[PDB]
Design a protein around this ligand. Structure first.
Ligand SMILES: C[S@@+](CC[C@H](N)C(=O)[O-])C[C@H]1O[C@@H](n2cnc3c(N)ncnc32)[C@H](O)[C@@H]1O
Ligand SMILES: [Zn+2]
Ligand SMILES: [Zn+2]
Ligand SMILES: [Zn+2]
Length: 232
């Protein structure tokens, strides 16, 4: 391939990735609503303050089991609650690096335990009409990098213009992280969680599950033995 010879030159030249606005929390756009519930619609888990790790990765916690974050004024474990990861934004340390075939990627600077919260997939929250427009734009300009992930009907996260490090995590068919929809303070959020123990220096990947909007035709370069050929 003469395509490859090109990408070898490229990997040496581009020193920084294209710029984006680094945000902490989803930012709705146009008509897009964000929902809330009364505290009464937030479940109280089975954990106790006296437990060893109340609401932790390895506890019996029904909230964590059913992908509900605890509310700190509702959880019986109180401030000892280890199930407030989205709200608190404590992420493992990570850094951007340049791959050969998959643009910029993300690698951890620390060890990560199986089940650990790694990041939230954060961006602009846009509708289908704004999503179609941005994908049309990118097609007309030979752009193949998409950052769009559906939260629910007519609410799409675009980590492209605005987002956090999660936007640099490539698809793999043999991934070490997984995307999950959690209920947080009465609305949905997308979290990334380690499938296994990950060593410092390793790239962080997830199965896009064909949810990366615009990548429907894209050939997978993950290089795994069981590669599907596609971003799913
Ligand atoms: C959320 S971005 C990930 C970061 C991106 N690599 C960058 O340089 O900003 C997703 C895009 O990365 C590329 N990509 C990610 N995983 C890939 C894979 N396994 N094979 C091919 N391209 C991939 C595609 O262009 C896709 O639209
Ligand atoms: Zn609990
Ligand atoms: Zn709790
Ligand atoms: Zn693959």
């Amino acid at each position: 391939g003469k395509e490859l010879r090109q990408l070898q030159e490229d990997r040496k030249n581009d020193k920084k990735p294209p710029p984006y606005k680094h945000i902490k929390v989803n930012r709705p756009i146009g008509r897009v609503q964000i929902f809330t519930a009364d505290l009464s619609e937030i479940p109280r888990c089975n954990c106790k303050a006296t437990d060893e790790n109340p609401c932790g990765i390895d506890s019996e916690c029904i909230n964590r089991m059913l992908l509900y974050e605890c509310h700190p004024t509702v959880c019986p474990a109180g401030g000892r609650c280890q199930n407030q990861c989205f709200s608190k934004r404590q992420y493992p340390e990570v850094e951007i690096f340049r791959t050969l075939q998959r643009g910029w990627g993300l690698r951890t600077k620390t060890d990560i335990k199986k089940g650990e919260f790694v990041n939230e997939y954060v961006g602009e929250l846009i509708d289908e009409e704004e999503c179609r427009a941005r994908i049309r734009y990118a097609q007309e300009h030979d752009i193949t990098n998409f950052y769009m992930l559906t939260l629910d009907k007519d609410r799409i996260i675009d980590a492209g213009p605005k987002g956090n490090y999660a936007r640099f995590m490539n698809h793999c068919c043999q991934p070490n992280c997984e995307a999950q929809k959690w209920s947080v303070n009465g609305d949905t959020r997308v979290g990334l969680f380690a499938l296994s123990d990950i060593k410092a220096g390793t790239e962080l990947t997830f199965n896009y599950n064909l949810e990366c909007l615009g990548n429907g035709k894209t050939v997978c370069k993950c290089g795994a033995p069981n590669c599907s050929g596609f971003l799913g």
